[PDB]
UniProtKB/Swiss-Prot annotation:
Tissue specificity note: Specifically expressed in brain.
Protein name: Rabphilin-3A
Self-association and partners: Interacts with RAB3B, RAB3C, RAB3D, RAB8A, RAB27A and RAB27B. Interacts with RAB3A; this interaction recruits RPH3A to synaptic vesicules. Interacts (via C2B domain) with SNAP25. Interacts with deubiquitinating enzyme CAND1; this interaction results in the deubiquitination of RPH3A. Interacts with GRIN2A and DLG4; this ternary complex regulates NMDA receptor composition at postsynaptic membranes. Interacts with SNCA.
Subcellular location(s) of the protein: Cytoplasmic vesicle, Secretory vesicle, Synaptic vesicle membrane; Cell projection, Dendritic spine; Postsynaptic cell membrane; Membrane
Domain notes: Binds calcium via the C2 domains. The calcium-bound C2 domains mediate interactions with phospholipid bilayers.
Domain C2: 10-140
Residues where Ca(2+) 4 binds: D41, D98, D100, D106
Positions in coiled-coil regions: none
PTM text: Ubiquitinated. Deubiquitinated by CAND1 to prevent its degradation.
Residue span relative to the full protein: 524 to 677 of 684
Residues reported in the UniProt entry to bind Ca(2+) 3: E6, D41, D47, D98, Y99, D100
Function in brief: Plays an essential role in docking and fusion steps of regulated exocytosis. At the presynaptic level, RPH3A is recruited by RAB3A to the synaptic vesicle membrane in a GTP-dependent manner where it modulates synaptic vesicle trafficking and calcium-triggered neurotransmitter release. In the post-synaptic compartment, forms a ternary complex with GRIN2A and DLG4 and regulates NMDA receptor stability. Also plays a role in the exocytosis of arginine vasopressin hormone.
Domain of life: Eukaryota
Length: 144
């Protein structure tokens, strides 16, 4: 609306699955859900959606927009055609956004999963690289 209705350390957590499928020849990325997202509207909620970019590259995907929730349930899967060893060249940028109708979308937070990450985000990538045809599901902290 017109009276700033669509306008914080804890940004939320995201549950992500990674599976390299040898039958299909590529990476399946699952965006399952987020929990305790930052509220980026005055009603105390957000309208979240998630964007994926497989860097450095078809490289991009996005989820649907869920309305008025800090705990969006997406259960959506995305596919990238890629050789397994070429995943060792890439990193997946994940960003979470609050859709607004009358202004720019608000940034909730993000995380990078891939070779230029650190800590548990790096390890998640490595577990997918080391384990073909296993679904590796982990929770990550969103960062600003
Ligand atoms: Ca907003
Ligand atoms: Ca909104």
């Amino acid at each position: 609306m017109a009276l700033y209705e669509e306008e914080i350390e804890e940004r939320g957590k995201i549950l992500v699955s990674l599976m390299y499928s040898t039958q299909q020849g590529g990476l399946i990325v699952g965006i399952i859900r987020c929990v305790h997202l930052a509220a980026m509207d005055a009603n105390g909620y957000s309208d979240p959606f998630v964007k994926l970019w497989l860097k450095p590259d078809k490289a991009k995907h996005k989820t649907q927009i869920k309305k008025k929730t800090l705990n969006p349930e997406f259960n959506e899967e995305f596919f990238y055609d890629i050789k397994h060893s070429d995943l060792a060249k890439k990193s997946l940028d994940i960003s979470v956004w609050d859709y607004d109708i009358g202004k720019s979308n608000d940034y909730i937070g993000g995380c990078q999963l891939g070779i230029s990450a650190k800590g548990e985000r790096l390890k998640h990538w490595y577990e997918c690289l080391k384990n073909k045809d296993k679904k590796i599901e982990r929770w990550h902290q969103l960062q600003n």
